[PDB]
Paper text:
Crystals of CoA-bound YpTesB diffracted to 2.2 Å resolution, revealing the same quaternary arrangement of domains as the apo form with density for two CoA molecules. CoA binding also provided additional density for the flexible loop regions that are missing in the apo YpTesB structure. Clear, contiguous density enabled residues Ala4–His285 to be modelled for each apo YpTesB protomer, with the exception of two flexible loops spanning residues 28–32 and 139–154. These regions could be modelled with more certainty in the CoA-bound YpTesB structure (see below) owing to interactions with the cofactor that stabilized these regions. That these binding regions are likely to represent the binding domains of octanoyl-CoA is further supported by the close proximity of the conserved active-site residues Asp204, Thr228 and Gln278. Interestingly, this double-hotdog protomer in YpTesB associates into a tetramer both in the crystal and in solution as determined across a range of biophysical assays. The structure also provides a basis for the observed specificity for octanoyl-CoA and other medium-chain fatty-acyl CoAs.
Acyl-CoA thioesterases catalyse the hydrolysis of the thioester bonds present within a wide range of acyl-CoA substrates, releasing free CoASH and the corresponding fatty-acyl conjugate. The [name]-type thioesterases are members of the TE4 thioesterase family, one of 25 thioesterase enzyme families characterized to date, and contain two fused hotdog domains in both prokaryote and eukaryote homologues. The [name] acyl-CoA thioesterase from [name] (YpTesB) is a 288-amino-acid protein and is a homologue of the human HIV Nef-binding protein ACOT8, sharing ∼40% amino-acid sequence identity. The [name] monomer is comprised of two hotdog domains arranged in a double-hotdog fold similar to TE4 and TE6 thioesterase family members.
Numbering used by the authors:
A (entry chain A): 2 to 29, 33 to 140, 145 to 285
B (entry chain B): 2 to 27, 33 to 139, 154 to 285
C-alpha cells in the first residue's frame, strides 16, 4: 500500500494555473505509464466534471528526465454538446517530450456489445512477477524486486534477460496493491499507467529476445487507448496482448483489458522501435 | 480511369506556403480529409521518411461545398523518425487534427498474424455489380453486402476486397494517401451489425470521433486488398472498430482503429 499511495500521490498533479500542471517523477528516464497517467490527470482537470475520458492518442518524442519535474500544458480544443477534446503537452527543459490528445464524453446509455474474454487460468493459481523475479540478475533497473504499486500475475513468465521463441501473445492479471478511492477518474489515471506494462515486449516473443538483453533498443513511439466501460483496479483485471506485426525495426501491439467477470474494459494500441544493436 | 483520376488529383494539394496546403472537397467524407492530411504532412518531411503511423480526431463536420486548409506543424526530426501535426481548417475553425510519424525504411524483426479465411475476390461481385442485380474510384467486392437502410442482426465482422479502379503510379506515397482515404470505407458501420440497424436508417446518428492507422508494410492499391473489420465493442453511445488490411497473398499491410458516435434518435 505504500508503493500504491506514492504512485497515486504522483498522479495527483500540482496546479500552476488553468490547464498548467506540474508533476514529479518516480525517479527510478521516466516510465511511459507515468507520463500517460499524469497527462490524463491534467486533461481531466480542464473538462466538465461529468465528462470522463473515453479515448486518447499519444506520441512519445523524447525520454523524460526522472530527476526533474514535468510540466503539462493543456490546450482546450473543443467543447461540444457531448464531447470535450484536449491536447496535453508534457514539457521538460523547454522541449516537449510527449503529446497526448484526449476526448471526454458525457455519460449516456446506448448500444451495447463486446467480444469475449480469452480463456485463461485464474489469478489465484499464479505467482506474482515480483516472486518470480527473485530468481534473477540484476542490471539495477530493479522495478522487479521491490514492492510494486500494481501486482502483476502472468499466465506465462517472460524472462527479460532471456527470450524463448514463443507465440506473440501475452496474458497478465493485475491489480492495485491496496484499496483505491471510490472515484472512477483515479482508477482511469492508474489504468493508463498500468496499460504501458507487459505491452510492447510482446512483439519480441517470436524472435526470442528478452527486452532487457544487452544491445536491444526498445522504445515506445505511440500509445493510444479507449475506455469502453467503468471498472475498478482494486479487483483483478486481465490484459490480453498480442503483437499482430513487426517490421521495419518497429513492433506493434494491441491489447484488451477485461474484468474478472469478463467485461471488456479498455483497448490499447502501441507501436515501438525494436532494434537489436 | 476517370473517377480514380479525379480522386488522385484531389489528393494532390495546392501549396499555399511551406506547411500550408489547400484541398478541394469532392458533408465531407472522412477519408478525404484523412488522405489529404497525409499529403500535407509528407510534403514537410525528409524525402526518404515515409509514414508509418498517424492518429486523428474529428472535431466538426466538414462542409463539402468549400475547400479545406491544412496547416502543418513540425514537431520533431529525430535520428530516424519525423513527426508532424496537421490541422484541417474550415470557416476559421479546426474540423480535424492529425499527428503523423514518418520513418526511414529499415530492416528489422518480421512477423505477422494470419489473414482471415474468406472467399477470394475473383468470384465476387463488385458493389456496382450488385447495384443493378456512376463509376467509383475504388472497386469494392464485399464478402457480404449490407443494406444501409435495412439492418439485421449480424456478427460484428465485415470483410471487403478493394482495388483502385485504374492503373496507379509507381509512387508508394500516392498508394499510401489512397489507402488512407480507403480506410474510412466499410468501417464504423460494422459496429451497428449486432443491432440490426443500417447506418443510413432514419434517426441513426453515426459520426467518426477518431481514426488511427499503422502502415506496417509497402503495398500496391492497384491489386486486390482485403479489409478485415471487427467491432470489438459498443457502449455509452459509441461504437468501436478495429481493422486490418492484407494484400492478396496474405501480407499484413496496415492496421486501423476508429471510435464513432452511434445514436438512435
Ligand atoms: C522518439 C524516438 C523514436 C526517438 O527516435 P530517434 O531520435 O529517431 O531515434 P532512433 O530510433 O534513430 O534512435 C537511435 C539512437 O537515438 C539516440 N537517442 C535517444 N534519444 C535521443 C534524442 N532525444 N535525440 C536524439 N537522439 C536520441 C539513441 O542513443 C540511439 O543511438 P543509435 O543511433 O546508436 O541507435 C524514441 O527513441 C524515443 O526517444 N521515444 C521517447 C522515449 C519515451 O518513451 N519517453 C517516455 C517519457 S515521455
Ligand atoms: Na491552455
Amino acid at each position: 500500500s505504500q508503493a500504491l499511495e506514492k504512485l497515486l500521490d504522483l498522479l495527483d498533479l500540482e496546479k500552476i494555473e488553468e490547464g498548467i500542471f506540474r508533476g514529479q517523477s518516480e525517479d527510478l528516464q521516466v516510465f511511459g505509464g507515468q507520463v500517460v497517467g499524469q497527462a490524463i490527470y491534467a486533461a481531466k482537470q480542464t473538462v466538465p466534471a461529468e465528462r470522463t475520458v473515453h479515448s486518447f492518442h499519444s506520441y512519445f518524442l523524447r525520454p523524460g528526465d526522472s530527476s526533474k519535474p514535468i510540466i503539462y500544458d493543456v490546450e482546450t480544443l473543443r467543447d461540444g454538446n457531448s464531447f470535450s477534446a484536449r491536447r496535453v503537452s508534457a514539457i521538460q527543459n523547454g522541449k516537449p517530450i510527449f503529446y497526448m490528445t484526449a476526448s471526454f464524453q458525457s455519460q449516456e446509455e446506448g448500444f451495447e456489445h463486446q467480444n469475449t474474454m480469452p480463456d485463461v487460468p485464474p489469478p489465484e493459481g499464479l505467482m506474482s512477477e515480483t516472486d518470480i523475479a527473485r530468481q534473477f540478475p540484476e542490471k539495477v533497473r530493479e522495478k522487479f524486486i521491490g514492492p510494486q504499486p500494481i501486482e502483476m500475475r502472468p499466465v506465462k513468465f517472460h524472462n527479460p534477460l532471456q527470450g524463448s521463441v514463443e507465440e506473440p501473445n501475452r496474458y497478465v492479471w493485475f491489480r492495485a496493491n491496496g484499496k483505491m478511492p471510490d472515484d472512477l477518474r483515479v482508477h482511469q489515471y492508474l489504468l493508463g499507467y498500468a496499460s504501458d506494462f507487459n505491452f510492447l515486449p510482446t512483439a519480441l516473443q517470436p524472435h526470442g529476445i528478452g527486452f532487457l538483453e544487452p544491445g536491444m533498443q526498445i522504445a515506445t513511439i505511440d500509445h493510444s487507448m479507449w475506455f469502453h466501460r467503468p471498472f475498478r483496479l482494486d479487483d483483478w483485471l486481465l490484459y490480453a496482448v498480442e503483437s499482430t506485426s513487426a517490421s521495419g525495426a518497429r513492433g506493434f501491439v494491441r491489447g484488451q483489458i477485461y474484468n474478472r467477470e469478463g467485461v471488456l474494459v479498455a483497448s490499447t494500441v502501441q507501436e515501438g522501435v525494436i532494434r537489436l544493436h
